[PDB]
């Protein structure tokens, strides 16, 4: 039996829902709460939480989907590198997460690269890539590495092990991203929210400390939350009270898994190999200081250090008609998309939001939301 | 995202039990992990420990302070 049963008790969920309703009655206007975690959206939609909530309490879904926001340029670039490598005699084994594998671009996906005869393997984590590198010294093994802080930490750890053993056929195409900088940008570009449900797993890595500047700089109340429905319900309840009491602080509802300081070992490992840079967010634009690239001292671990390719200019981020940009910004839900459930489906997806496991569109589709 | 119980530890690798399914997990981010620990795993790596005992203690401590400040 998994510890912390109270956090997944249906009876507790009922009382929290009832409590939220009461607090909302005496709410002056409307409260808009945003979360930036696909797992949170999954919890929310799967348990019909938006339905259980008062009319004046809205849960907005932010860009909490690392694959969705991976730029087209990088995906196509990895494809060109695969071709150029082969042409130059060097054979490469490419690893990628399952959803990124089917991510569309105006010139094909990694699945198309596979069908053209390239060794493209689906992995569940960077340690898989590592073993593959071990078992194939004669080949250059590269993992197209996307992900927020929670996925970047294991990448950092594995790079640390590779550098010690001096593994030389183990590379990555870094498209790692930072979450807080994206929340800041959304705040400044128009997404309106009065409270934030900070991502629980990302917070495990960067701690409550990693989110504090947003409250000190923008005066917005935050709750670091777990992923059980009660974790989210609790976070919503707490944000409402803070909003009503005019408080501006961060509450660590996920105290059981998140230290205030975060995971220092992970943090140092990340700082050792990566450096912050401005970066593109598919369908959203360029967010300053929001991405990670390998430091010069470690250029040898980045596959791009070994192959210069030129990605065709002007590749559109999305297919015509896709509102994944509005969905990612929390400005619209998948049901506000004319294509949702018709032209666009997991089977025949139009945009990245429908392909990704963490995609808000896939999540809505998967749980039969017809709305 | 389900937590797992560490049943085996061998250097940087642990065997974690997730509802009867056992998988190998890297411990690089949680070096002091030991058999019996409950951990959260992401993409093959343990990222944090779950200590219900600790959590219950903090709760009781908090209640004791409030109970005392209120009159019980
Ligand atoms: S349903 Fe499809 S097409 Fe509409 S935004 Fe979501 S992914 Fe884009």
From TrEMBL, chain A:
Residues with PTM Cysteine sulfinic acid (-SO2H): 37
Alphabetized UniProt keyword annotations: 4Fe-4S, Iron, Iron-sulfur, Metal-binding
A Pfam family hit: HypD
InterPro entries: Hyd_form_HypD (IPR002780), HypD_1 (IPR042243), HypD_2_sf (IPR042244)
Biological process, per Gene Ontology: protein maturation
Gene Ontology MF: a single term: carbon monoxide binding
Disulphide-bonded residues: 65-68, 324-353
Annotated binding of [4Fe-4S] cluster, by residue: 322, 337, 344, 361
Family to which the UniProt record says this protein belongs: Belongs to the HypD family.
Designated name of the protein: hydrogenase expression/formation protein HypD
Originating gene: Tk-hypD
UniProtKB/TrEMBL annotation, chain B:
Example of a GO MF term: carbon dioxide binding
A Pfam family this chain is assigned to: HupF_HypC
Protein's GO biological process: protein maturation
Family statement: Belongs to the HupF/HypC family.
PANTHER family assigned: HYDROGENASE MATURATION FACTOR HYBG (PTHR35177:SF2)
Protein name: Hydrogenase expression/formation protein HypC
Gene it is expressed from: Tk-hypC
């Amino acid at each position: 039996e998994e510890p912390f049963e109270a956090y997944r008790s249906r009876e507790v969920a009922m009382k929290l829902v009832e409590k939220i309703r009461e607090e909302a009655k005496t709410l002056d206007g409307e409260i808009r709460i945003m979360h930036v975690c696909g797992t949170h959206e999954d919890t929310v939609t799967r348990h019909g939480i938006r339905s259980l909530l008062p009319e004046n309490v809205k849960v907005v879904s932010g860009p909490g989907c690392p694959v969705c926001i991976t730029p087209v340029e990088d995906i196509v670039a990895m494809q060109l590198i695969m071709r150029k490598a082969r042409e130059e005699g060097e054979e490469i084994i490419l690893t990628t997460f399952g959803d990124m594998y089917k991510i569309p671009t105006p010139m094909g996906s990694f699945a198309d690269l596979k069908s053209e005869g390239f060794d493209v393997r689906i992995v569940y984590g960077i340690f898989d890539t590592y073993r593959i590198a071990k078992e194939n010294p004669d080949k250059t093994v590269v993992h197209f590495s996307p992900g927020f802080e929670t996925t970047t930490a294991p990448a950092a750890g594995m790079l640390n092990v590779a550098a010690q053993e001096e593994l030389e056929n183990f590379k990555i195409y870094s498209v790692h991203r930072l979450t807080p900088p994206a929340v800041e940008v959304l705040l400044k570009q128009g997404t309106v929210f009065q409270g934030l449900i900070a991502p629980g797993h990302v917070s495990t890595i960067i701690g409550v400390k990693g989110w504090e500047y947003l409250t000190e700089k923008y005066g917005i109340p935050q709750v670091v939350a777990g992923f059980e429905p009660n974790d989210v319900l609790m976070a919503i309840l707490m944000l409402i009270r803070m909003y009503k009491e005019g408080e501006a602080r961060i509450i660590n509802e996920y105290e059981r898994a998140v230290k205030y300081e975060g995971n220092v070992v992970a943090q140092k490992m990340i700082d050792k190999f990566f450096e912050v840079v401005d970066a593109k967010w598919r369908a959203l634009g360029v967010f300053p200081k929001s991405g990670l690239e390998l430091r010069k001292e470690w250029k040898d671990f980045e596959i791009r250090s070994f192959y210069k390719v030129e990605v065709p200019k002007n590749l559109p981020d999305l297919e015509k008609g896709c509102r994944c940009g509005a969905v990612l910004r929390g400005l619209a839900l998948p049901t506000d998309c004319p294509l949702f459930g018709k032209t666009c489906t997991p089977r025949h997806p139009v945009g990245p939001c429908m392909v990704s496991y963490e995609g808000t569109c896939q999540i809505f589709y998967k749980y039969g939301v017809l709305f | 995202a389900v937590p797992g119980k560490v049943i085996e530890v061998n250097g940087p690798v642990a065997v974690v039990d997730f509802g009867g399914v056992k998988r190998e997990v890297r411990l690089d981010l949680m070096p002091d992990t030991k058999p019996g620990d409950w951990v959260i795993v992401h993409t093959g790596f343990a990222i944090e420990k779950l200590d219900e005992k600790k959590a219950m203690e903090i709760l009781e401590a908090w209640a004791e302070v409030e109970k005392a400040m209120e009159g019980f």
